[PDB]
Amino acid sequence: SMLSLTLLGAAVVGQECEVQIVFKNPLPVTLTNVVFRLEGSGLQRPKILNVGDIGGNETVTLRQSFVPVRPGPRQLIASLDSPQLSQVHGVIQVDVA
Amino acid sequence: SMLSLTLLGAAVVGQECEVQIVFKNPLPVTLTNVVFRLEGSGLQRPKILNVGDIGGNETVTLRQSFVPVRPGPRQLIASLDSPQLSQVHGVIQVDVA
Amino acid sequence: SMLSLTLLGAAVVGQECEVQIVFKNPLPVTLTNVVFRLEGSGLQRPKILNVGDIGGNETVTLRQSFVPVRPGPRQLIASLDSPQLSQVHGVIQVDVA
Amino acid sequence: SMLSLTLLGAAVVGQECEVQIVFKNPLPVTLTNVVFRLEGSGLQRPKILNVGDIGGNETVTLRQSFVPVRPGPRQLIASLDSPQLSQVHGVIQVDVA
Amino acid sequence: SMLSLTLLGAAVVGQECEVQIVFKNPLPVTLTNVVFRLEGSGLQRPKILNVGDIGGNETVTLRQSFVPVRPGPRQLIASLDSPQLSQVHGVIQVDVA
Amino acid sequence: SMLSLTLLGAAVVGQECEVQIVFKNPLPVTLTNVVFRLEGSGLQRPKILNVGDIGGNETVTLRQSFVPVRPGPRQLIASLDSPQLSQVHGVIQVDVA
Amino acid sequence: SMLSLTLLGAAVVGQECEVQIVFKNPLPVTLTNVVFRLEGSGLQRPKILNVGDIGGNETVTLRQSFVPVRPGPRQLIASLDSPQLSQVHGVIQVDVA
Amino acid sequence: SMLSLTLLGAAVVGQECEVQIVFKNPLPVTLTNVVFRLEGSGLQRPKILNVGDIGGNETVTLRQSFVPVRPGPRQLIASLDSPQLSQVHGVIQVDVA
Amino acid sequence: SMLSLTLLGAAVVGQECEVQIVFKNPLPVTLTNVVFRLEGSGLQRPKILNVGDIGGNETVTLRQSFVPVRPGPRQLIASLDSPQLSQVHGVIQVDVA
Amino acid sequence: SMLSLTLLGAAVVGQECEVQIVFKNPLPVTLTNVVFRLEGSGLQRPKILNVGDIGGNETVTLRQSFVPVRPGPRQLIASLDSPQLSQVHGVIQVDVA
Amino acid sequence: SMLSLTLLGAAVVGQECEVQIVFKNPLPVTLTNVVFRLEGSGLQRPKILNVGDIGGNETVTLRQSFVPVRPGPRQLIASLDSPQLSQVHGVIQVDVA
Amino acid sequence: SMLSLTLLGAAVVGQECEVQIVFKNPLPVTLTNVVFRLEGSGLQRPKILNVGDIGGNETVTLRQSFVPVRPGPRQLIASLDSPQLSQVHGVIQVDVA
Amino acid sequence: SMLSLTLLGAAVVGQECEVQIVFKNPLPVTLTNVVFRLEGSGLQRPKILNVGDIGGNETVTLRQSFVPVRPGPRQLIASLDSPQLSQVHGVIQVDVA
Amino acid sequence: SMLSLTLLGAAVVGQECEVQIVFKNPLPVTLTNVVFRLEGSGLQRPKILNVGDIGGNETVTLRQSFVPVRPGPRQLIASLDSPQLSQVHGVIQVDVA
Amino acid sequence: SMLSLTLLGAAVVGQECEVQIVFKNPLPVTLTNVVFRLEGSGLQRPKILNVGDIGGNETVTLRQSFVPVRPGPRQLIASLDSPQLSQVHGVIQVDVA
Amino acid sequence: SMLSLTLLGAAVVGQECEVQIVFKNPLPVTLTNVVFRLEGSGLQRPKILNVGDIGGNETVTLRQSFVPVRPGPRQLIASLDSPQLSQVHGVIQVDVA
Amino acid sequence: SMLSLTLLGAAVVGQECEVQIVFKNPLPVTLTNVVFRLEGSGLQRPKILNVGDIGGNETVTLRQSFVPVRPGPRQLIASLDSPQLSQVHGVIQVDVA
Amino acid sequence: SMLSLTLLGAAVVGQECEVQIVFKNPLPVTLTNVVFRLEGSGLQRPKILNVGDIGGNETVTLRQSFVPVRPGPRQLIASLDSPQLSQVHGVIQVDVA
Amino acid sequence: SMLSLTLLGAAVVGQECEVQIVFKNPLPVTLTNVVFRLEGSGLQRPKILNVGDIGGNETVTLRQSFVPVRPGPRQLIASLDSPQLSQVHGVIQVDVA
Amino acid sequence: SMLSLTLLGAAVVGQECEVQIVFKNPLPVTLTNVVFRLEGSGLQRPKILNVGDIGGNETVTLRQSFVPVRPGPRQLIASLDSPQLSQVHGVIQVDVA
Amino acid sequence: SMLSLTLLGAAVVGQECEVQIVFKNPLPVTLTNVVFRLEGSGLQRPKILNVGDIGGNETVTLRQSFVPVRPGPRQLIASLDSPQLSQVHGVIQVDVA
């Protein structure tokens, strides 16, 4: 799906930093039991966050703060888990009289 | 995978309607515990159907009737769930003497 | 993901044969509870192998021997299962001061 | 039309084999008196099967088993006969108030 | 062949409507025993019309009225049947002295 | 299918002329009850010829003489009729052990 | 507009010949006072024919016979005159509730 | 020429509606005796409006209200008639000392 | 049609100037009642000239002198009016024996 | 240069025929001593015609009648001779204050 | 030239097999002394066949049976020899009055 | 090789006609025993002409007259035979000190 | 050939002006009897200048002054006449030992 | 026009050498008073040769021997002069009945 | 076919030189009676060499020494003659069981 | 060949770091005496590692830890040495009966 | 370099087979100590052959027979080893006076 | 690698000449035991030169004089040998904190 | 800038030769203190020539003779020096009232 | 470099006018001794202006007023002179730890 | 010209570093009075180095060490000054006999 991450400030060892996650539900159905995770070497001990069911076609944002511990090019990895994302889907528009 | 849906009649509020689902197993292995679901706003309370294991390379069809309840452009969403669809696969043709 | 298979010898009914599986972890995070499976008609009763967690960005190889039982064009199918492969991921490089 | 054939197992002289035929009615009208035939050198004495009228836009599948008699590259030919397939058709979508 | 259909008015449930069919004989030979059919869900009980042999290269038009019975996106299907349309043809221009 | 016609001499009013028809069976199955017809304005009163069943993949040739009756650019039309040409076919190569 | 002409036989000095004119009204409005003309050197003294108003989107055909008087490459010119063809038009589809 | 139409509100049976016509004189000369017409099935009994001569290169706008009478996809057709539009023109820029 | 204009000298306020008009009849029929007009701001009070019927495929030239009255970039507009230019035409080459 | 020829009627052995020659002076200078020639096998004994000096940028037309003497595909060749056509020219626009 | 070969059955060691050769004379002249040869390793001891002169533009077919002696991918080579095939040719269409 | 033919006059039944053959030796070696042949239906009984050895890179021309006997589109075929044209050649430029 | 003209100052009515002509002999042979001419409306009464034979591959320049007499966009035309420019040439590089 | 030159031997100082000139008349008319010239530095004092009128569409060849006098890359220039080559031509195919 | 030549040393008048010829049999059949020839102006009096039959698909090499006699750009021409090279061939891969 | 390197952690002066090397044998033959080397400025004193013969088509991985000594953009260079990598190879698939 | 392999017969278990190796020295220098090797699974125990120094630009061929031992798709690998193939080369053509 | 050669003067038999060799080390590692060789027919008896280890990324130049002995197009070949050039390398940029 | 050089004769050791230099001032300003130099190995001891200031947009030619002293491919280098050529320029056309 | 000029008002003879010059230093080094010049025919007697050293990457603007003296299309030329603009430069980004 | 710079080690504040400059003379003439300069912010106080005249076509290398004083992305700029680089050049290859 289309998950994006943006830093909302500079990243400096010690200084607090903030990232925003933006996810748009690609499906016209509700995504249930949505768990977001965030990790990265020298950045953030694995964080896990509960997200409210995401209605079909809906975008959600979340903000997460972290304090970098080690300097240099480092990765921040966000993930999203829900049962509806392991299913194969098919969609048809029905134009009802 | 390649799941398709086709209406087998007109969609009118009240009048019964019928959709056919066609799924071709992309894998040369059996898909087990196959559950099909069907939903859509103003169309069909979430329907869930058991499907027999789908042998490798095999296509299955199913027909499902519904009565539209609310008019206008509406979505019908079919889904397919099986453990084998969350696995990463690799295939090589072996030409045996 | 990028899973590949290579035969390390000729395939003849009776004669033992060997295939190598090479998988590169696409994610910068650890893949846990990794199970590899191997099957194919006339080739190999379903084999299941435990793999050690795969660190982020890491490649693993495995060798598996089998004795073809039936001749002709036949498929060997390798699969890989891990919870981290059913999650949607997003990655940003953070350049830390 | 779009008729497809898939083998549902290996082809070996003697051993039984199975093919699946998948046909999607291209027309929004019913195909009547549908006869399917199957043949091939060294494969299958000409088999002829009755198929139920195929409603407009509908897909049908059929499974047919055969025992190869002679080895090597061989053809399996499926055919479909119905009066509606020798007619020239024209279709317009009418959007009715 | 090139069969076309055009509505000669608006389509409203109840109100009479009219469609014109235009067919150009692609062959330089006469099409005999030409039967035109017209159908569509919620539009027109299957209508069947006799057409006079169509000389080579000749276009014919026909007008057919119908009363839509059910609203929404609906199909009107015209067909044309003649023995000469199931034959394979080859044409050469001979420049005679 | 691929039917071709070639003149085997000049076309002059009065003078006898000869055309050759070459047809290659596109299907790997036998074409039965094959009737060839030949016509053209100012060229040849409708000629009809019986052809022997055409085995799969087989080419046949036939020669037909005519005496042009009227000068100018004129058409010669050859046709081929057989029940197997109104059927929809599907072919798969089976590689048998 | 799209006016077409087709010969419905060979053209020989003396022998009668026939041409068909096919015109499709490009406008969704009625073409009134429609006059068709036909001429050509060595073919047809200027012929003028009255045509019934052509409803919007409607195709009309007409057949006209002539006797060529002089041989060689010659032109047949058909024309169509109506006041509505000298007007500049603009069309918008209005989708009415 | 470039005539355009725009709806200045929604189209509902009964409710009044308004369309604007915009025409830009393509010619550097005056268009005289300019008559605009407006029609459409289920929309507007043929309306005819006098327009003041349109100076060369000049754009004019006009607003026309109508009450849709019948629902569904319907056409509104605007036309423009003037003697200068049936003439063939040629333009050269002369750069005068 | 293809009307062209060329200046046959320099354009200076006061000094006489000359333009040539070249028109090639696109139609294989005669253009009757041909009126040519010439105008332009600061160039030429509207001039109107009678032209002899233009036979099919024929080119005509005319020369017209004018005295520019006002300086700067100015337009000269030539027009051509004939009833045959408001008709829709169709042409077929007939090759007569 | 751009010399063109058009037949102003049909070409028949015996019958008189007419061709028009159209030449546009490509040079902004006068072409002097202009001789036009016309010839063709079975068409026209070499005809030679004097043409008046052709002012710069000027088009001239001429009509020439001939009686074909021998039938079939034949060439008509027009030529134009003037001293100014064997000179190499260069042109620059000077924009004078 | 365009020589083609087609198998008219399966190729099995021992079992008889049949190939058809189709050759279309590219030249509008007669090919004389035409010898066809057929060979292939493990297929057919060199066979040589006399063919009747091939008139210009004419296609000939021939059928030749062989019994494969040795298995595997094998070549069948057909050749055609005639003096007219070692000559360099040039062709012009002459349109005779 | 590059053999060309040109008619040096019109082709009329009875009237004498003339064709020129132009052949450029593609090889830097001498072509010996060069025989030219000319034929065509309704044109020229097979003519055979001796040509002098053609030095490497050399062009030769020949003129041949014939009297067409039968009218219409007809072929003239020129051929060239020499032993050096059935050989496979290879050329390298050697730059000698 | 490649003749160019350049103004070596501004062009103002009255004020003297200067143009340079540059011509490069395209031929490897001498151009004899070379006459250059210069003209233009409102610029320069026809000037004629003798030029010395131009050796093969040689460029010559000439300067010519004129006084514009009339303002506005005006043409200056340079020409070059020599017998060698009306000849058709062919050039081959010979590499001599 | 298309004039070509070919050396018919090696070029060595002292040794005699031979060049062939091939010219194809591009015009369907006769080229009269045809003079060919040949020159080149260190190759051939200007040679001038009379050629017989070249009928329309006709190719001529000529052979000319020379003795190179000075070594190195040198040019041989052939030219062709005739009055018909300084004329502007136009050609139309007339298809005569 | 693909014949190549390579010099195996420098080419100097007097000094011996060596060329290698490499030919790959394009046909899967044997080339018999293979004669190779070598010639070139100022290089090698015509040399003729017998070559052993060339089995199908086989490459042969040959070395030939010569003493250049005359300096400058010179050609060496190798040729290959065999009856099998004047035959037209057709090849099909037969996959034998 | 295709050698790749991946860091399995962040690179910080002092902190230990780990790189993985992945090499796929491109050859279907065994690579013997395989030595891997690793170096880089400010990264790793030249490390040399013995690798077991690499069977044909086989991939090997190795992990190597290092402690960066100096900061900034730095190179890590892996190399692979074996005698089989300095040989030129050619491979053909033989399909054996 | 460009090493090629060709089978000179069919490959059958037991039956002797023959392959030809063709190598063209890409370098203008001599390749010394040239060793060719041949191997393949189920085909040929590693064969090693001495080759004579290969002069610059020279092609060599070698024939090697083997008896396949095991059936199916199998590889034959040829290699070539020489010190000059591990060197980096640069070549410039010097044109010496 | 990128080795280049440039002549630093003209090449004449007898006269001394000079070439410069420029080699840029493609690797970020040191090339050891670097031997440069120079040869060419008629140019330079094989010269061999010791070069100092080439640090990573470093370019070296060398000048070598020779006296051409034999005239004509001749090759100068430079080579470079070092153990590091027969190794397969992989490079990753590590950005160290 | 655009400086060109052309030889005005053959280059032979001893024999005098002549080159022409053509330079077009790219700038609309005067180039002052213009020095031209000419040199080349075995051609011309460095020659230096004074050139008169080159007005804006002006082309100059110069002829320089030299006697080649040494044979073979040799360079002639012309240069041009002026202070205005080391300046960076910008040009705008101002259209003044 | 990138020097631009813009008029900051209309250009009229007599009326004062103003141009702005904008130059961006392309080099990361200081441009010293920078002299700007401005000239144009009928515009501005050569103006010369001192500019302060231009630091690396820096843009400077200057405004210069002039009074056009003569009308028509005229050039304004700005130039820039500095020693650093006649030097050849090379730039590498060094990323320093 | 083509000047390049390469670092021959890592860049760290304090630590010594080394850059190599490589310049290839683009001109076939000698570059005299060649001065190289090197500078960069936080890298190297302006260094100036004398270089020996660079013969035509010759490459020179130079090594220069510096100690970075300030960290971060910084520029090193090399320049080259010589009078011959401000001259406009033209080169022609003369092939001398």
Side-chain angles (χ1 to χ4, degrees), chain J residues 11 14 17 25 34 43 49 53-54 61 64 70 81-82 91 97:
Chain J
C17 194
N25 187 359
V34 185
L43 292 164
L49 290 144
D53 291 357
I54 302 172
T61 81
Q64 192 60 53
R70 272 154 296 171
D81 191 7
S82 176
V91 205

Side-chain angles (χ1 to χ4, degrees), chain K residues 28-29 88-90 92 94 96-97, chain L residues 5 11 39 72 74 76 78-80 85:
Chain K
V29 76
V88 185
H89 307 263
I92 192 153
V94 180
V96 186
Chain L
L5 298 75
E39 23 200 310
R74 302 254 161 195
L76 212 49
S79 62
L80 207 300
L85 298 170

Side-chain angles (χ1 to χ4, degrees), chain H residues 2-14 16-40 42-44 46 48-92 94 96-97:
Chain H
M2 246 81 201
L3 193 53
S4 61
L5 298 75
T6 318
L7 294 182
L8 310 185
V12 186
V13 182
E16 185 161 299
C17 194
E18 193 163 28
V19 64
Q20 185 183 35
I21 315 303
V22 176
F23 177 75
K24 173 106 157 77
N25 187 359
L27 303 169
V29 76
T30 297
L31 295 177
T32 60
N33 295 23
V34 185
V35 183
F36 156 92
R37 290 175 169 75
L38 187 63
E39 23 200 310
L43 292 164
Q44 176 60 84
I48 188 171
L49 290 144
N50 220 59
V51 182
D53 291 357
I54 302 172
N57 305 312
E58 194 160 300
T59 300
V60 289
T61 81
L62 41 172
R63 290 212 208 169
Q64 192 60 53
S65 50
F66 60 96
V67 186
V69 56
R70 272 154 296 171
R74 302 254 161 195
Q75 303 255 54
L76 212 49
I77 311 105
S79 62
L80 207 300
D81 191 7
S82 176
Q84 283 74 44
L85 298 170
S86 313
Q87 298 178 359
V88 185
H89 307 263
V91 205
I92 192 153
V94 180
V96 186

Side-chain angles (χ1 to χ4, degrees), chain T residues 59-74:
Chain T
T59 300
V60 289
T61 81
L62 41 172
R63 290 212 208 169
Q64 192 60 53
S65 50
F66 60 96
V67 186
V69 56
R70 272 154 296 171
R74 302 254 161 195

Side-chain angles (χ1 to χ4, degrees), chain G residues 11-14 16-40 42-44 46 48-64:
Chain G
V12 186
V13 182
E16 185 161 299
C17 194
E18 193 163 28
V19 64
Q20 185 183 35
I21 315 303
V22 176
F23 177 75
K24 173 106 157 77
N25 187 359
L27 303 169
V29 76
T30 297
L31 295 177
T32 60
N33 295 23
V34 185
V35 183
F36 156 92
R37 290 175 169 75
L38 187 63
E39 23 200 310
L43 292 164
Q44 176 60 84
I48 188 171
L49 290 144
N50 220 59
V51 182
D53 291 357
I54 302 172
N57 305 312
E58 194 160 300
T59 300
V60 289
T61 81
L62 41 172
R63 290 212 208 169
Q64 192 60 53

Side-chain angles (χ1 to χ4, degrees), chain B residues 2-14 16-40 42-44 46 48-92 94 96-97:
Chain B
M2 246 81 201
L3 193 53
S4 61
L5 298 75
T6 318
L7 294 182
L8 310 185
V12 186
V13 182
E16 185 161 299
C17 194
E18 193 163 28
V19 64
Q20 185 183 35
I21 315 303
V22 176
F23 177 75
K24 173 106 157 77
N25 187 359
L27 303 169
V29 76
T30 297
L31 295 177
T32 60
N33 295 23
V34 185
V35 183
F36 156 92
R37 290 175 169 75
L38 187 63
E39 23 200 310
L43 292 164
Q44 176 60 84
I48 188 171
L49 290 144
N50 220 59
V51 182
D53 291 357
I54 302 172
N57 305 312
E58 194 160 300
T59 300
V60 289
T61 81
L62 41 172
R63 290 212 208 169
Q64 192 60 53
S65 50
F66 60 96
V67 186
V69 56
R70 272 154 296 171
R74 302 254 161 195
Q75 303 255 54
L76 212 49
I77 311 105
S79 62
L80 207 300
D81 191 7
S82 176
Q84 283 74 44
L85 298 170
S86 313
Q87 298 178 359
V88 185
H89 307 263
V91 205
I92 192 153
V94 180
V96 186

Side-chain angles (χ1 to χ4, degrees), chain K residues 2-14 16-40 42-44 46 48-92 94 96-97:
Chain K
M2 246 81 201
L3 193 53
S4 61
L5 298 75
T6 318
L7 294 182
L8 310 185
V12 186
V13 182
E16 185 161 299
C17 194
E18 193 163 28
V19 64
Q20 185 183 35
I21 315 303
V22 176
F23 177 75
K24 173 106 157 77
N25 187 359
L27 303 169
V29 76
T30 297
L31 295 177
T32 60
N33 295 23
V34 185
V35 183
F36 156 92
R37 290 175 169 75
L38 187 63
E39 23 200 310
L43 292 164
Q44 176 60 84
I48 188 171
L49 290 144
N50 220 59
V51 182
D53 291 357
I54 302 172
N57 305 312
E58 194 160 300
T59 300
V60 289
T61 81
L62 41 172
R63 290 212 208 169
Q64 192 60 53
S65 50
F66 60 96
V67 186
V69 56
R70 272 154 296 171
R74 302 254 161 195
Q75 303 255 54
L76 212 49
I77 311 105
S79 62
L80 207 300
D81 191 7
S82 176
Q84 283 74 44
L85 298 170
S86 313
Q87 298 178 359
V88 185
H89 307 263
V91 205
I92 192 153
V94 180
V96 186

Side-chain angles (χ1 to χ4, degrees), chain M residues 34-40 42-44 46 48-89:
Chain M
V34 185
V35 183
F36 156 92
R37 290 175 169 75
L38 187 63
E39 23 200 310
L43 292 164
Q44 176 60 84
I48 188 171
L49 290 144
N50 220 59
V51 182
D53 291 357
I54 302 172
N57 305 312
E58 194 160 300
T59 300
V60 289
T61 81
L62 41 172
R63 290 212 208 169
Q64 192 60 53
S65 50
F66 60 96
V67 186
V69 56
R70 272 154 296 171
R74 302 254 161 195
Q75 303 255 54
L76 212 49
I77 311 105
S79 62
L80 207 300
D81 191 7
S82 176
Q84 283 74 44
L85 298 170
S86 313
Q87 298 178 359
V88 185
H89 307 263

